[PDB]
Amino acid sequence: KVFGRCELAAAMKRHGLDNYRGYSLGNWVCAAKFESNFNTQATNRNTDGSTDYGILQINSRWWCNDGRTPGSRNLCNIPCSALLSSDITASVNCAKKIVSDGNGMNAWVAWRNRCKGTDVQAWIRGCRL
Structure with a gap:
């Protein structure tokens, strides 16, 4: 399934990611964008x-x-x-286990490079949550 941006934002919120280990929802949506382009079937x-x-x-x-x-x-x-x-x-x-293992969201190379330190809440703005 290829999620839409707002579709994924809402789903991630329903699964308890907003502020998980201190990471606001936009971090998680941004990570998914740059890791998989929102595709659940992505592999590397x-x-x-x-x-x-x-x-x-x-x-x-x-x-x-x-x-x-x-x-x-x-x-x-x-x-x-x-x-x-x-x-x-x-x-x-x-993901909740990974992010809790001592390295925070730095585990995700895409997050480190395209999300960390940016206005990540842009990834959820305009969406029904």
Whole structure:
């Protein structure tokens, strides 16, 4: 599913991301924009043979199990396929674990480069929440 901007903003709010670990909703929408272009089916293969999955590009080494990645730990206790769903629950729940692991939203390279320190609330302005 390719979410619309406001569609995703509302969904992320319904799943408890607004101000989660101090990160306002626009941070999460901005992260999804620059990680996946709002596409729940997005994937990215890495040099180590791991893959990033879903709207928040969660990696198969530490976080989800894709059965094809060396050094797998599956800390989110989910198949990576669950991160490709139209329902964002699995991606949100795993993202909450990632962001809480000591590194905040710096875990998301796209967020660091295109969202951190900007007027991220622009990503939710104009939307029904």
